[PDB]
């Protein structure tokens, strides 16, 4: 049918999305999955949320990414309003007004990461790696576990993704370009790309690799 998760809420807010669900015969879970069809976000006045994991895996799945107000209104008018007219435009980080999920919902015939071999390297925070990996898989990259697992050939296009903050290391991440032959960039590359569903490119994200 439908299936939901929420993000950014509070018990009372949540209780309220429940009310919605109960009434409308909608399924409501803790945890986003293949099958989750909606993602209800805390937003301000006019549909800017903050950037959370569910936020991204939201867009990645081309799921319905709608601001809490869908709910409270659909309650207030005692029926189900158009997800169509409630989508989240943007976010505090990536612009109040960037049509993210829009692009994404409709661009399912051409994922931003067509023909990419991505590899999330070294440790991340607030975001389990496997979830990051799940994310790019969702935009039709394909995941690599270790740098030396990169499909060689001119065939495809590899990229190493790191996030420098979670490191304690000096011989660390300036040095990936030695252990192979790929662009290296920050996780921000992926998130900003995914936010906008606009495949950013990498000038601004490159990490300086020791030759």
């Amino acid at each position: 049918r439908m299936s939901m998760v929420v993000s950014g809420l509070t018990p009372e807010e949540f209780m309220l999305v429940y009310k919605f669900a109960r009434k409308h015969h909608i399924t409501l879970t803790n945890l986003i999955t293949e099958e989750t069809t909606h993602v209800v976000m805390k937003t301000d006045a006019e549909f800017v949320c903050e950037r959370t994991l569910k936020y991204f895996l939201g867009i990645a799945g081309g799921k319905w990414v709608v601001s809490y107000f869908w709910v409270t209104q659909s309650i207030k008018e005692r029926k189900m309003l158009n997800e169509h007219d409630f989508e989240v435009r943007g976010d505090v980080v990536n612009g109040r007004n960037h049509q993210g999920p829009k692009r994404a919902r409709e661009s399912q015939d051409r994922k931003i990461f067509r023909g990419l071999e991505i590899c999330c390297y070294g440790p991340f925070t607030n975001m389990p790696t496997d979830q990051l990996e799940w994310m790019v898989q969702l935009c039709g990259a394909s995941v690599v576990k270790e740098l030396s697992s990169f499909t060689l050939g001119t065939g495809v296009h590899p990229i190493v993704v790191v996030q420098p903050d979670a490191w304690t290391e000096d011989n660390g991440f300036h040095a990936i370009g030695q252990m192979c032959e790929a662009p290296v960039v920050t996780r921000e590359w992926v998130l900003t790309s995914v936010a906008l569903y606009q495949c950013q490119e990498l000038d601004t994200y490159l990490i300086p690799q020791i030759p």
């Binding site: 950014g8 903050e50 959370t52 994991l53 569910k54 980080v93 607030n126 975001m127 998130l191």
Partner: peptide
């Protein structure tokens, strides 16, 4: 939830 964390944010980004």
């Amino acid at each position: 939830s964390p944010t980004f």
